[PDB]
Amino acid sequence: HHHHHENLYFQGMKRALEFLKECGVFYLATNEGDQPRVRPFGAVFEYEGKLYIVSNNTKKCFKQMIQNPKVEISGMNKKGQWIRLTGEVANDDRREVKELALEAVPSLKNMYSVDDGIFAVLYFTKGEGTICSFKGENETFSL
Amino acid sequence: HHHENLYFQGMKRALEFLKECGVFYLATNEGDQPRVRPFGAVFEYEGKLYIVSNNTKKCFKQMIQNPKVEISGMNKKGQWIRLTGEVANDDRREVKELALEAVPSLKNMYSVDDGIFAVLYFTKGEGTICSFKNETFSL
Numbered sequence A: 001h002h003h004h005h006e007n008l009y010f011q012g013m014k015r016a017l018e019f020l021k022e023c024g025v026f027y028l029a030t031n032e033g034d035q036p037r038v039r040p041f042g043a044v045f046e047y048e049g050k051l052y053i054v055s056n057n058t059k060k061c062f063k064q065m066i067q068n069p070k071v072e073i074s075g076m077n078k079k080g081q082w083i084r085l086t087g088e089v090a091n092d093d094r095r096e097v098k099e100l101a102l103e104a105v106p107s108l109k110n111m112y113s114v115d116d117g118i119f120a121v122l123y124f125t126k127g128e129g130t131i132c133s134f135k136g137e138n139e140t141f142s143l
Numbered sequence B: 001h002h003h004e005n006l007y008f009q010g011m012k013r014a015l016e017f018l019k020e021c022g023v024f025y026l027a028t029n030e031g032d033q034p035r036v037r038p039f040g041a042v043f044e045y046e047g048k049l050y051i052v053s054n055n056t057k058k059c060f061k062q063m064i065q066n067p068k069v070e071i072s073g074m075n076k077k078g079q080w081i082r083l084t085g086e087v088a089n090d091d092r093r094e095v096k097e098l099a100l101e102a103v104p105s106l107k108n109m110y111s112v113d114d115g116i117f118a119v120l121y122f123t124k125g126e127g128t129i130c131s132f133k134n135e136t137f138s139l
């Protein structure tokens, strides 16, 4: 990842965001040492050209992402197209991002609030993805 | 024969649930890099839960290098599963034959003696089924 290619990465980020929105639910894979872990995730938003996911700083999945920032996401839309997005995540501790998350995905307010001490937002510092279709060439992108 | 059912009950519950899911997600490691992709089939053979792959795929190679995996997926009722375990390859023709009858879409690509088709079963595992509202079991 290079900051001066941010114009290119932005287009890949927007495609990933769009596609993950089409999927609705998607699956986030982490490691706990040599044990893979996977669970459904369902909230994504953009801020300052970055793709964010949300979690809770008390959860195993969060602790896993801190201990090993490498993750992979996969999901499928109603047409049977699917994504694989490989990358690294960083926790963003800025209060303003938490506020924005709750406005972008207001259903989050059912569980989280800005000053609850548990709400976490994390973004992809880098990543590479492929969107696969039954018919047609793979679409590849970077963020 | 509750005692005897125990060999089967966790596996049967996982099988039933993953069939309800249709598509589920299989996570492996490639060293320190987690990997996940959609899977679309499951079958049982003599009390064990099987999945399919082919021996040229990265996912298969990853499962041989590190047998630890986790599966997750959601059914049509707002429930989801987390199934953690270890997998083993099974080279037997008889199991591959049953696979092709249990999952007939495979016949489109695979045959028992094609040198590529692979089936793997859970040697052990632990599952949890959750709802927006937890059932746990062991394979």
Ligand SMILES: Cc1cc2nc3c(=O)[nH]c(=O)nc-3n(C[C@H](O)[C@H](O)[C@H](O)COP(=O)(O)O)c2cc1C
Residues within 6 Å of the ligand: A025, A037, A039, A040, A041, A042, A043, A054, A055, A056, A059, A060, A061, A062, B080
């Ligand atoms: C549809 C759906 C969407 C979800 N979205 C998220 C989410 O975006 N972030 C999150 O932290 N948990 C989300 N969850 C909850 C996690 O799957 C759950 O907390 C899981 O247990 C966390 O992983 P862990 O047990 O390894 O810590 C979602 C669950 C469902 C079923």
